[PDB]
């Protein structure tokens, strides 16, 4: 079965950094564009970033430009999101997704990121 599994979430200080991983199995990852989405409190789901097969970013949301970097490792079949200069409003469940025209969408279960002044340093 197709598997997408996010990890790397947790609590982090405002201004801090986190790197999320989306480890995949059960399909030819290197053939697909891949995406990060997020679901924040009281808001609609938001597309964060997309990446093409060869590992070039296709898109960043205005809200994350200059702070986040999408990347992939086709040898490990893993997608990443490096997040920097985190803000309270980046608190959300983050999801990786495989989506393509006339194909079936697949989503991970998501990972919680919490940007909090009470986070460990
Ligand atoms: Na896709």
Residue numbers in the entry: 1 to 121
What do the study authors state?
In this study, we obtained two sdAbs (sdAb A and B) with VH‐like hallmark residues and low solubility from an alpaca immune library. To obtain sdAbs against Nlgn2, we prepared the extracellular domain of Nlgn2 as a recombinant protein and immunized an alpaca with it. We employed site‐directed mutagenesis and introduced all four VHH‐like mutations (V37Y, G44E, L45R, W47L) into the hallmark residues in FR2 of both sdAb A and B (denoted as sdAb FR2 YERL mutants) and prepared the FR2 YERL mutants as recombinant proteins.
The sdAb A FR2 YERL mutant was eluted as a monodispersed peak in subsequent SEC, whereas the sdAb B FR2 YERL mutant showed a broad polydispersed peak. The L11 residue normally interacts with the CH1 domain on the IgG antibody; this domain lacks the camelid heavy chain antibody (Hamers‐Casterman et al., 1993) and the exposed L11 residue should be hydrophobic. Taken together with a previous study suggesting that mutation of leucine to serine would improve the solubility of VHH (Muyldermans et al., 1994), we introduced the L11S mutation in the sdAb A FR2 YERL mutant (denoted as sdAb A YERLS, the terminal S corresponds to L11S) to investigate the effects of this mutation on solubility. We expressed and purified sdAb A YERLS by IMAC, conducted SEC, and confirmed that sdAb A YERLS was eluted in a monomeric state. To confirm that the mutations did not alter the overall structure of the sdABs, we conducted X‐ray crystallographic analysis for both sdAb A YERLS and sdAb B YERLA. When FR structures were superposed, the root‐mean‐squared deviation (C α‐RMSD) values between the crystal structure of mutants and predicted WT structures were 0.58 Å and 0.40 Å for sdAb A and B, respectively. Differential scanning calorimetry (DSC) analysis of the sdAbs revealed that the melting temperature (T m) of sdAb A YERLS was higher than that of sdAb B YERLA.
